[PDB]
């Protein structure tokens, strides 16, 4: 369809999450925690209570929410699922992206993993479920090795969760259709339809031999299923609002649940009515990852809509009450600190500067043309600061801003990218002459300044920061190709740019003509 | 802001607008999405039919406000 150019205004290193965390993976051999950030960055942390700075690395390739991650191959390989419609394959030890799968056509929401087959599956809002052989994915070229997919059909609505068993013999999807759908991943054959839930199902777990399934649903219930009988064998109503996250011990006898009501419970499957409040988190729980160092898990890591990630200890579980008031725990055992998200954005009348407000009520002033921050203004009044900087000037709209990652993402579209002519003098530039500059055209040239095909470097008036992410996407989300501005001179990047840069950008950046 | 529009089939579509946008802008955005001429459109908000020349803030239309699209069955 119609191809948009975007870029992110940010620092070269974003040490802290800038948004909530969608998913968690624990490498037990290296004591490393992976977080899948809503800020589009995956980060590796050390979980040694020794280290003063648990940050290890950021893995920067996605353009939107990272919704799920799966550590494969004894921690060598990470696979990620994002709202940018892609699945990416990472070297988890060195922290770089190796391949990008683009078979999904909407937000990819869930990943599933069959350890014994090195099989992963992806599913999203497009109602598709693709199956991927992990050993098959490392494809350097089209002759030595083309990656191939296999997919399942039947989902009548957007898929929100997905699980496989360890043996890779059962796969289950959860969706807004309120039925769980089951296939054999080996044959892609439909096996059964599990009916019972009255709302979306965002959490799924299978036991080791794929004979029982636990589902967590926005209707507030947890349901246990027998796959041999194709029926529900127990329903648990331990939450007040939607259940979004489930974990289970190795024995498949205690289930840990969390969701919108922020409360996290451990409930015994053999005696449902006895449930224990482990803690109440500070924000809706999105995902939980048990620490499995010991059979009775010593701790549980919890991801929420906040940028902080808390580890809660479990030492002291040996109750009676069905609706406990007092949480078992009150303070996290470890805390990985997060940063603020930009939650409000106003484009000024000059169509050049932006005022932001973040979750700390801090206000900043940015230069869209130079792709950078200008000054932090502290905790001033946001609307009073807007009215204070009002200038009676009209410039046609020529970009759009989005806050989906918590950082500033600027998008250019062919329809209005070239709408804003300004004079060199009023834009603060100097060569001398004072001709008329097109803002979108100069920016496009700065974004592709390192692309050799644009040479005869840059636009002659300003540069963007070299680390600026440059994104080529389809209208309404779907990323085609993403690179950093400085990397355009690469052999891989120049080939991929030639394949992805739309002719309406080529016109300005290559042919040098409006 | 994002407003809702109930089309002739009963299907809801979203429109990105601003409070200072005139009703003519909204009808032109519906023409972009539904191919219906603006002079042939009739838009109801909470029982009140919108008039050209006025803006969305004149009718106190906010985010998640629903406009109902109909036509003029002249007889």
């Amino acid at each position: 369809r119609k191809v948009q150019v975007s870029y992110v205004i940010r620092d070269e290193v974003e040490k802290y999450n800038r948004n909530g965390v969608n998913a968690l993976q624990l490498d037990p051999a290296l004591n490393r925690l992976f977080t899948a950030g809503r800020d589009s960055i995956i980060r590796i942390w050390s979980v040694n209570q020794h280290k003063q700075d648990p940050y290890i690395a950021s893995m920067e390739h996605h353009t939107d929410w990272v919704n799920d991650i799966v550590l494969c191959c004894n921690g060598k390989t990470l696979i990620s699922a994002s709202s940018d419609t892609t699945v990416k394959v990472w070297n988890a030890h060195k922290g770089f992206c190796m391949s990008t799968l683009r078979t999904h056509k909407d937000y990819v929401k869930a990943l599933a993993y069959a350890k014994d087959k090195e099989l992963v599956a992806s599913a999203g809002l497009d109602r598709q479920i693709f199956l991927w052989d992990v050993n098959t994915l490392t494809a350097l070229t089209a002759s030595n090795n083309t990656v191939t997919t296999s997919s399942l059909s039947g989902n009548k609505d957007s898929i929100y969760s997905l699980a496989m068993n360890q043996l890779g013999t059962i796969i289950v999807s959860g969706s807004t259709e309120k039925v769980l759908r089951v296939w054999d991943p080996r044959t892609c054959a439909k096996l059964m339809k599990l009916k019972g839930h009255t709302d979306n199902v965002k959490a799924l777990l299978l036991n080791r031999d794929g004979t029982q399934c636990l589902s967590g649903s926005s209707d507030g219930t947890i349901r246990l299923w027998s796959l041999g009988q194709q029926r529900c064998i127990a329903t648990y109503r331990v939450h007040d609002e939607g259940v979004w996250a489930l974990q289970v011990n190795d024995a498949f006898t205690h289930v840990y649940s969390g969701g919108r009501d922020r409360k996290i419970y451990c409930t015994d499957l053999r005696n449902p009515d006895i449930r224990v409040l482990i803690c109440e988190e500070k924000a809706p729980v999105l995902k939980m990852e048990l620490d499995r160092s010991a059979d009775p898990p010593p701790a549980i890591w919890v991801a929420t809509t906040k940028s902080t990630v808390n580890k809660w200890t479990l030492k002291g579980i040996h109750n009676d009450c069905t609706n406990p008031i007092t949480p078992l725990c009150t303070q996290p055992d470890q805390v990985i600190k997060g940063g603020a998200s930009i939650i409000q954005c106003h484009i000024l009348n000059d169509k050049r500067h932006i005022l932001t407000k973040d979750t700390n009520n801090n206000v900043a002033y940015w230069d869209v043309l130079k792709a950078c921050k200008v000054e932090d203004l502290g905790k001033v009044d946001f609307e009073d600061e807007i009215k204070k900087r009002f200038k009676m000037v009209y410039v046609p709209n020529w970009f759009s801003v989005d806050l989906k990652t918590g950082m500033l993402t600027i998008t250019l579209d062919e329809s209005d990218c070239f709408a804003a002519w300004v004079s060199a003098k009023d834009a603060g530039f100097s060569s001398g002459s004072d001709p008329k500059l097109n803002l979108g055209g100069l920016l496009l040239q700065a974004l592709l300044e390192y692309w050799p095909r644009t040479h005869v470097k840059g636009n002659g008036y300003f540069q963007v920061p070299p680390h600026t992410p440059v994104i080529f996407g389809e209208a309404g989300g779907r990323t085609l190709f993403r690179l950093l501005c400085r990397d355009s001179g690469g052999e891989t990047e120049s080939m991929l740019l030639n394949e992805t840069v739309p002719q309406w950008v080529i016109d300005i950046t290559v042919d040098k003509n409006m | 802001m994002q407003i809702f529009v109930k089309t002739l089939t009963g299907k809801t579509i979203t429109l990105e607008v601003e409070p200072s946008d005139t009703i003519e802008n909204v009808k032109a955005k519906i023409q972009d999405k539904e191919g219906i001429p603006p002079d042939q459109q009739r838009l109801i908000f909470a029982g009140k039919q919108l008039e050209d020349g006025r803006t969305l803030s004149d009718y106190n239309i906010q985010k998640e406000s629903t406009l109902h699209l109909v036509l003029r069955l002249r007889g």
């Binding site: 709202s83 | 979203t14 036509l71 069955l73």
Partner: protein
């Protein structure tokens, strides 16, 4: 020769759009009594909305008098029994100059203009009285309270908007036969918003999938159903849909209500349009007699008002023409039982 005691309405030059809804308003339960009360308040205290109330009382009395003139000695009249509503047309021309001339117009649009102006009168007289039931006229007869629920499927936050409504804008076909149950469900039932048209969750700060539902909260005495008997392709470009819905006699909005009720509504009036295009056509009305003076030979039958003309059609014979043709339904009026 076989003349009827019910009064028609002269066509003054493409004014069947006005005559159709006026004949429906006359037969609405509280309308006649209500405009008399609003006339009696303006007659005490005190142009614009006041003139519209007087014009409405001028016509209603003119219709009531002409019927009494016929019931006294019907041998005075031959093959016609109708009155002209010129004062109401002139005030409407002053309220909206589009009604000037003699062009064709939408019946729903003129009903909205009349009811909306009467309500402005009620609210203007509420202020002039309180500064020093009647003014509840439009609100208890035709107007209802709607509840539009939007639920982000990401965070499951459910926001709400209360909007008033006087009719229920309803689709006729999808783009074999669709019932009215289907059609109201297209309006009110859950509608998932997905794909290249995603809801923007301000809490999530992200485009998300959403579930939208509309619920009826406060319901009035008359439920108006406004059918969208037309569609567009983009090819003047627009077209009428001649095939209508399967129209029931009894209606209940319990399944789309905010709270369980046992209120059932009964169809009593239908406004129809005849023509292949939207640009022009012919409006008529059809009204069922229900509930007081010796005229009970007709109770249960359907009177058809075609401008100055008026017929009596049978319950079964009219009901067949209402569903799949000649004229096609455009408005449906139900009333509480």
């Amino acid at each position: 020769e076989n003349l009827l005691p019910f009064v028609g309405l002269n066509n003054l030059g493409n004014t069947c759009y006005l005559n159709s809804i006026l004949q429906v308003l006359y037969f609405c339960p509280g309308f006649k009594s209500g405009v008399k009360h609003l006339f009696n308040i303006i007659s005490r205290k005190k142009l614009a909305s006041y003139e519209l109330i007087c014009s409405l009382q001028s016509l209603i009395i003119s219709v009531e008098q002409l019927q009494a003139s016929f019931l006294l000695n019907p041998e005075k009249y031959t093959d016609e029994l109708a009155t002209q509503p010129r004062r109401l047309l002139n005030t409407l021309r002053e309220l909206n100059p589009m009604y000037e001339g003699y062009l064709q117009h939408d019946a729903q649009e003129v009903l909205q203009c009349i009811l909306g102006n009467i309500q402005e009168t009620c609210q203007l007289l509420k202020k002039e009285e309180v500064k020093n039931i009647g003014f509840e006229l439009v609100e208890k007869l035709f107007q209802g309270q709607l509840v539009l629920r939007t639920r982000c499927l990401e965070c499951e936050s459910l926001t709400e908007r209360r909007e008033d409504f006087q009719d229920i804008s309803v689709p006729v076909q999808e783009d074999e036969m669709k019932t009215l149950r289907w059609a109201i469900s297209q309006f009110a039932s859950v509608e998932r918003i997905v794909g290249e048209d995603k809801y923007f969750c301000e809490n999530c700060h992200h485009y998300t999938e959403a579930e939208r539902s509309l619920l009826f909260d406060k319901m009035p005495e008359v439920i108006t159903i406004h059918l969208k008997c037309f569609a567009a392709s983009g090819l003047g470009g627009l077209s009428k849909i001649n095939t209508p819905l399967l129209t029931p006699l009894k209606l209940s909005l319990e399944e789309w209500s905010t709270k369980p009720t046992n209120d059932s509504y009964g169809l009593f009036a239908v406004v129809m349009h005849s023509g292949i295009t939207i640009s022009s056509g012919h409006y008529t009305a059809s009204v069922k007699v229900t509930d007081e003076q010796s005229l009970k030979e007709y109770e249960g039958k359907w009177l058809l008002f075609d401008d100055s003309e008026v017929k009596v059609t049978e319950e079964k014979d009219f009901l067949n023409s209402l569903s799949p043709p000649t004229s096609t339904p455009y408005l449906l009026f139900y009333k509480k039982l």
